[PDB]
Write an enzyme that holds these catalytic residues in place. Structure first.
Site, PDB file in Angstrom:
ATOM      1  N   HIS A 121       4.831  -2.986   3.894  1.00 36.76           N
ATOM      2  CA  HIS A 121       4.799  -2.206   5.170  1.00 36.76           C
ATOM      3  C   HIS A 121       3.117  -2.306   5.921  1.00 36.76           C
ATOM      4  O   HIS A 121       2.223  -2.448   5.102  1.00 36.76           O
ATOM      5  CB  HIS A 121       5.193  -0.694   5.036  1.00 36.76           C
ATOM      6  CG  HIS A 121       6.541  -0.947   4.701  1.00 36.76           C
ATOM      7  ND1 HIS A 121       7.558  -1.135   5.609  1.00 36.76           N
ATOM      8  CD2 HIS A 121       7.297  -0.494   3.473  1.00 36.76           C
ATOM      9  CE1 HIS A 121       8.721  -1.065   5.054  1.00 36.76           C
ATOM     10  NE2 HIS A 121       8.597  -0.555   3.671  1.00 36.76           N
ATOM     11  N   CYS A 163       4.095  -5.412   9.173  1.00 35.48           N
ATOM     12  CA  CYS A 163       4.240  -5.177  10.751  1.00 35.48           C
ATOM     13  C   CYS A 163       3.180  -5.117  11.411  1.00 35.48           C
ATOM     14  O   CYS A 163       2.139  -4.640  10.777  1.00 35.48           O
ATOM     15  CB  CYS A 163       5.155  -3.774  10.945  1.00 35.48           C
ATOM     16  SG  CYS A 163       6.730  -3.830  10.331  1.00 35.48           S
TER      17      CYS A 163
END
Ligand SMILES: CC(=O)N[C@@H]1[C@@H](O)[C@H](O)[C@@H](CO)O[C@H]1O
Ligand SMILES: CC(=O)N[C@@H]1[C@@H](O)[C@H](O)[C@@H](CO)O[C@H]1O
Lengths: 409, 409
Positions: A121, A163
């Protein structure tokens, strides 16, 4: 020289199975290419292979073909030892700075090459590390500069699956460090998850969690299906950029970006990834899920596979927490800039080539102030890092941030 | 015959000054055209002219020219008597059904014409009434049908200034009632506020609240600057549609829509609005604010005109409440349809010409269930009416809605 590698999964929990599956697959690929285990450092929380939810105990797969990638993977830095501090120490090659783990470090020579792969992440200017830890991009670039100034290597290739991963290097990654970098997305895009339950591809039906991440499986499946003495770093970048764009449908795909020393793209991939003597010959649109959406989809499918009340309450608590973070950040924008101005300030994206934040120490301080009043950001909360960077950039003081956070929470 | 009118401001509070200013301006316009006070029913909460914040006590203005529009306006239905029940009774012309107020009703004859103007807040399929009351579109169409079947009038024109006002008539307003309707916006657009502090136009500097609403002041300023024996209903519609679109910049303008009997557009406006003998001769882009944004901007300007802590806490409580409603509705979508499906179901807009909801009684029930667990919607909450209509349309049961609302709140 010698080829080294550092593979890092920045997440934990069965929901994030794919990040450790990606890392384990990269490890197997590197071994098949002739890289030695002593030169490959693996960071994985290691809560997946024997998780009570795993339908194949002691096994991890990274695509619907179901080949195990867990067996033989070393337990270098696992559990509590998967930290930014240990990652930095490992890259620097300083055994005395490591806390816990195996003690394996990248104590490389000036003639050596290094390959770094990170999967999980992220958010603007940041990467996740397990149990709500945040790794700031400038701290990572600082380690690269230190390693370069100590004559630690000849060249380095870094692949980052997260991301808004382009924001980790835009405007801050120097081109003079002999380091070439690719990211799964540009500075303002999320990254994509693949091999999800209920999708084509078509994963083994017993799986309730996604098996891999789009950019990660694009590079790995490309590497293992080509002769790496013939394939260049550039050819891999192009094939990964094409596959990750998902037929240039950016509503379910992302822009693979490149940073650093582009002269390295002319090099043959085997100088970094090794050569598999089995691949000595040789040279459809994918249904994908947003990284931030995978957790809720996992819980929902868990719910549907018994639709039970404990699971539904867990979904509500997760959404209520995300709504609290989203709401608090929005409210801080209102208190600092006024209604109608808060959102454009917090959400505006700088032009490509510019750093996310001018002062990285101020960014850490804004996050510290926020968490002290509004609670931990958690991995989801990393999406709000551009809002914090924009507060720093606007010239708003830390005393004013303290006041706004206090009113908001 | 006789010309009648019903003017309604659906809101209260100094922040909503403009809605009562619009209504008072419409009253003065109608009197100047020869409509008699006994035939004009005014619904206004009446908390503005003598409000402690009013810098011109006993005066209300509706544009920067500063002409008072309050003096002479009758107190037909004010305060607690501004209800949907009284509005319906007034339109039906049944004095025995009115509760409180002056008792003035539209006890009209078959040869009479009626003009209805509403100004405030709204949402999909609904209009606001003061102190968190909600007026449902089908209940309003039901009154029109009843009034038509009792031979209450020859023709009627209705002007509606509210967010998503087109949704009050789309797919439900019959064309056989001798009623022509125009709305400030289409079924999926907000409406706009004009003459705001800090804008050009350029209102009197002592004002801290907006003076008028875009569609409302477009029709009124058009009417009072033309000969209404020469101007048609169509010419007014066209001029208002052009002015309200704000140079076809729909990011700060809206689509004026028309419904009902379009044959009425050929009629001269004086048959509904009267004729001012003073206007016997005759035939720039505006800075505007979103209706839902005016409240926060008002509080922020109040804050800046002393930047004090009580005001900042008031802003936080307002934003936290809006975030609670937005979050609860989003969470209900997740619990009923699953993540990734909740948002497309709750937010999808039907094609123009189709009713917002197939079952209006189910819509009222979904709102009742929601408010019983999540608290009052308040005027802001009306923006979520399409989500409730979409839950009804999807075939989801009231028992399932009860369960989702219970988990969410
Ligand atoms: C960052 C970097 O190495 N840039 C080099 C540049 O200095 C050199 O002139 C050129 C030669 O082809 O290749 C590129
Ligand atoms: C709703 C309505 O009144 N529609 C009428 C239509 O019936 C008539 O044939 C036509 C004559 O011009 O005008 C229009």
């Amino acid at each position: 020289g010698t080829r080294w590698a550092v593979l890092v999964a920045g997440s934990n929990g069965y929901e994030n199975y794919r990040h450790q599956a990606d890392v384990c697959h990269a490890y197997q690929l590197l071994i098949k290419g002739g890289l030695k285990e002593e030169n490959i450092v693996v960071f994985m929380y290691d809560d997946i292979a024997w998780h009570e939810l795993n339908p194949r105990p002691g096994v991890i797969i990274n695509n619907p073909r179901g080949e195990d990638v867990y067996a033989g993977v070393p337990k270098d830095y696992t559990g509590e030892d998967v930290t930014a501090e240990n990652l930095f120490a490992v890259i620097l090659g300083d055994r005395s700075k490591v806390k816990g783990g195996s003690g394996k470090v990248i104590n490389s020579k000036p003639e050596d090459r290094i390959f770094i792969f990170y999967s999980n992440h992220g958010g603007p200017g940041v990467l996740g590390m397990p149990n709500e830890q945040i790794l700031y991009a400038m701290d990572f670039i600082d380690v690269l500069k230190k390693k370069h100034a100590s004559g630690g290597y000849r060249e380095m290739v870094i692949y980052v699956e997260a991301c808004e991963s382009g924001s980790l290097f835009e405007g801050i990654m120097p081109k003079d460090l002999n380091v070439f970098v690719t990211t799964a997305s540009n500075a303002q895009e999320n990254s994509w998850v693949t091999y999800c339950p209920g999708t084509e591809p078509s994963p083994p039906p017993e799986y309730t969690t996604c098996l891999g991440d789009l950019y990660s499986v694009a590079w790995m499946e490309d590497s293992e299906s080509h002769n790496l003495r013939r394939e260049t770093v550039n050819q891999q970048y192009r094939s990964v950029k094409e596959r990750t764009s998902n037929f240039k449908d950016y509503a379910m795909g992302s822009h693979v970006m490149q940073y650093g020393d582009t002269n390295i793209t002319a090099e043959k991939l085997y100088l970094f990834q090794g050569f598999d003597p089995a691949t000595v010959n040789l040279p459809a649109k994918m249904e994908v899920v947003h990284q931030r959406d995978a957790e809720l989809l996992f819980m929902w499918q868990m719910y549907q596979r018994s639709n039970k009340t404990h699971i539904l309450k867990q979904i509500a608590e997760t959404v209520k927490h995300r709504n609290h973070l989203d709401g608090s950040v929005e409210l801080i924008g209102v208190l600092l800039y006024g209604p109608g101005k808060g959102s454009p300030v917090l959400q505006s994206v700088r032009d490509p080539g510019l750093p996310l934040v001018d002062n990285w120490a101020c960014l850490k301080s804004m996050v510290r102030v926020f968490e002290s009043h509004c609670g931990s950001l958690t991995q989801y909360g990393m999406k709000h890092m551009r809002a914090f960077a924009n507060i720093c950039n606007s010239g708003v003081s830390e005393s004013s941030m303290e006041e706004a956070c206090m009113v908001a929470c």
